[PDB]
Amino acid sequence: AKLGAVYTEGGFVEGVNKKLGLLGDSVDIFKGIPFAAPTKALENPQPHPGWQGTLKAKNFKKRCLQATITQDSTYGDEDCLYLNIWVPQGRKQVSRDLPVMIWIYGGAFLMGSGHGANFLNNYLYDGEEIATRGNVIVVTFNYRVGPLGFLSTGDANLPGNYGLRDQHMAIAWVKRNIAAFGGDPNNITLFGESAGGASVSLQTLSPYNKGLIRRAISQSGVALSPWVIQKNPLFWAKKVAEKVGCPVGDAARMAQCLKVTDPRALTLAYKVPMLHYVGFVPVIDGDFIPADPINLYANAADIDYIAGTNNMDGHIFASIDMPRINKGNKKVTEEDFYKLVSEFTITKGLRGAKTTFDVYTESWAQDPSQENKKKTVVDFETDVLFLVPTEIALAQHRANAKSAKTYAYLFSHPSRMPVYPKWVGADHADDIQYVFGKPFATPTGYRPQDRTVSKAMIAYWTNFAKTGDPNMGDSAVPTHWEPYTTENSGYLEITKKMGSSSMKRSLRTNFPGIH
Cβ(174)–Cβ(182) below 8 Å = no
Q: Report the relative pairing of strands 503-504 and 491-494 from DSSP bridges.
A: antiparallel
Q: Report the relative pairing of strands 11-14 and 6-8 from DSSP bridges.
A: antiparallel
Cβ(196)–Cβ(219) below 8 Å = yes
Q: How far is CA 149 from the centre of its chain?
A: 16
Q: Which residues form the domain of 76?
A: 1-515
Q: How far apart are CA 200 and CA 303, in angstroms?
A: 12
Integer angstrom CA distances of residue 240 from 168, 169, 281, 401 = 26, 27, 14, 42
Q: Is 313 a catalytic residue?
A: yes
- Identify the active-site residue in 285, 313, 379, 383: 313
DSSP 442-460: SGGGS-HHHHHHHHHHHHH
Q: Report which DSSP code applies to 58.
A: B
In 10 A of CB 22, how many CB atoms? Answer: 7
- Identify the active-site residue in 115, 285, 428, 475: 428
* Adjacent-strand bridge partners of 309: 410
Integer angstrom CA distances of residue 1 from 17, 18, 91, 95, 220 = 9, 11, 5, 9, 38
Integer angstrom CA distances of residue 253 from 50, 153, 247, 256 = 34, 12, 7, 5
* Adjacent-strand bridge partners of 183: 98
Count structural domains, the chain: 1
Q: How far apart are CA 295 and CA 448, in angstroms?
A: 44
Crossing angle between the packed helical segments 233-244 and 251-260, to the nearest 10 degrees = 50
Q: What 3-state class would DSSP assign to 236?
A: helix
Edge-to-edge strands of the sheet including 11-14? 6-8, 11-14, 54-56
Q: How far apart are CA 291 and CA 354, in angstroms?
A: 30
Dihedral over Cα of 489, 219, 133, 404: its sign: positive
Q: Which of 282, 287, 106 is nearest to 206 (CA)?
A: 287
- CATH number of the CATH domain containing 455: 3.40.50.1820
Kind plus residue range of the DSSP H or E element containing 378: helix 370-382
- Contacts (Cβ under 8 Å, ≥6 apart) of 341: 353, 356, 357, 360, 380, 513
Kind plus residue range of the DSSP H or E element containing 244: helix 233-244
Long-range contacts at 479-488 (CB < 8 A, ≥ 24 apart): 479/503, 481/407, 481/409, 483/405, 483/406, 483/407, 484/394, 484/398, 484/406, 484/407, 484/408, 485/398, 485/406, 486/398, 486/399
Cβ(357)–Cβ(364) below 8 Å = no
* Adjacent-strand bridge partners of 17: 28
Q: What is the CA radius of gyration of the chain?
A: 23
**How would you classify residue 126: left for phi > 0, otherwise alpha for psi between -120 and 50, otherwise beta?**
beta
Integer angstrom CA distances of residue 328 from 159, 331, 371, 386 = 47, 7, 9, 26
Edge-to-edge strands of the sheet including 183-193? 16-19, 26-34, 82-89, 137-141, 98-104, 183-193, 215-219, 304-310, 406-411, 491-494, 503-504
Q: Which of 12, 179, 10, 15 is nearest to 100 (CA)?
A: 179
Dihedral over Cα of 149, 99, 218, 193: its sign: negative
Cβ(237)–Cβ(250) below 8 Å = no
Cβ(413)–Cβ(429) below 8 Å = no
- Contacts (Cβ under 8 Å, ≥6 apart) of 347: 353, 355
Dihedral over Cα of 18, 137, 39, 161: its sign: negative
Cβ(181)–Cβ(3) below 8 Å = yes
* Adjacent-strand bridge partners of 310: 411
Q: How far apart are CA 29 and CA 84, in angstroms?
A: 8
Cβ(177)–Cβ(89) below 8 Å = no
The CA-based angle 488-494-499, given to 5 degrees, is 75
Q: What 3-state class would DSSP assign to 156?
A: coil
Q: How far apart are CA 100 and CA 436, in angstroms?
A: 15
Q: How far apart are CA 282 and CA 230, in angstroms?
A: 6
Cβ(254)–Cβ(153) below 8 Å = yes
Q: How far apart are CA 364 and CA 144, in angstroms?
A: 44
Distance between start and end Cα atoms, the chain:
52
- Contacts (Cβ under 8 Å, ≥6 apart) of 433: 415, 439, 450, 454
Q: How far apart are CA 173 and CA 430, in angstroms?
A: 30
* Adjacent-strand bridge partners of 56: 14
Q: Is 427 a catalytic residue?
A: no
Print the SS3 string covering 457-495: HHHHHHHHHHHCCCCCCCCCCCCCCCCCCCCCCCEEEEC
- Identify the active-site residue in 26, 95, 194, 199: 194
- The runs of H, that is alpha helices, within 108-186 are 128-133, 146-150, 162-177
* Adjacent-strand bridge partners of 192: 104, 218
* Torsion angle, alpha carbons of 145, 147, 152, 157, to 10: -100
* Adjacent-strand bridge partners of 304: 215
Q: How far apart are CA 164 and CA 158, in angstroms?
A: 14
Cβ(99)–Cβ(468) below 8 Å = no
Kind plus residue range of the DSSP H or E element containing 254: helix 251-260
Q: Report which DSSP code applies to 394.
A: H
Q: What 3-state class would DSSP assign to 413?
A: coil
Q: How far apart are CA 217 and CA 458, in angstroms?
A: 13
